[PDB]
């Protein structure tokens, strides 16, 4: 690995600097290097890993959507032929996106998930597995699309089962998992009713547990609850 010669602590320090500088590709490379040291990640370090790759893949997804829309318009009736360039460039961006997803999934499989025994870490990583399969599903069109969708579903489901047994209904990781799995149902699995039911049930069960929380915990949980409500408003 490119970061093999840098201390773990230095990689973490530089990931934080990269975040401050909005250098998310660098941040991701530093965090990949940190993971490859082989030690488990702390809570803070999990957040850094997430933030880095979310920003990288988020930019790729946005670009892919722009290019896909242009490509769709080119294939409309009465649209003038412009040659292979739109498809080629969409394919280039797509391949880069898939490479980032494969990188993340590789870190989770080697060996973050298998060493994660605490509920918070295991749910966090399985949620991430579901998310990155979801991103692969967004661009899939071939004979593996169904299997990619099922890989996302399976990861989310395992995370859900653990979260319901081991975490309170207000736990931010549990809430964020439910938010994202609900979006999977709506956008990927063609199951809008399941999406809506999950978001509603999650919201309501969290509402009922808010009374147990400190001011700081309340802030965290209510922020994510509002995202659930936002999606519900979009969908109903």
């Amino acid at each position: 690995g490119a970061m093999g010669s840098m201390e773990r602590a230095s990689l973490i320090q530089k990931a934080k600097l990269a975040e401050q500088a909005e250098r998310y590709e660098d941040m991701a490379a530093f965090m990949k290097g940190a993971v490859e040291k082989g030690e488990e990640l702390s809570c803070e370090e999990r957040n850094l890993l997430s933030v880095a790759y979310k920003n990288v893949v988020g930019g790729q997804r946005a670009a892919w959507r722009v290019l896909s829309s242009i490509e769709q318009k080119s294939n409309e009736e009465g649209s003038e032929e412009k040659g292979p360039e739109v498809r080629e460039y969409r394919e280039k961006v797509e391949t880069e996106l898939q490479g980032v997803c494969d990188t993340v999934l590789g870190l989770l499989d080697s060996h973050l998930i298998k060493e994660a025994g605490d509920a918070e870490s295991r749910v966090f990583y399985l949620k991430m597995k579901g998310d990155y399969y979801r991103y692969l599903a967004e661009v899939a069109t071939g004979d593996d699309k169904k299997r990619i969708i099922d890989s996302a579903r399976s990861a989310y489901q395992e995370a859900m089962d653990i979260s319901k047994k081991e975490m309170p209904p207000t736990n931010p990781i549990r809430l964020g998992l439910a938010l994202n799995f609900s979006v999977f149902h709506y956008e990927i699995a063609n199951s809008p009713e399941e999406a809506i039911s999950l978001a509603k049930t999650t919201f309501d069960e969290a509402m009922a547990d808010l009374h147990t929380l400190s001011e700081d915990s309340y802030k965290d949980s209510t922020l994510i609850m509002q995202l659930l409500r936002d999606n519900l408003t979009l969908w109903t």
Partner: peptide
């Protein structure tokens, strides 16, 4: 697009 975290 819907919200995710």
């Amino acid at each position: 697009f819907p919200a995710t975290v």
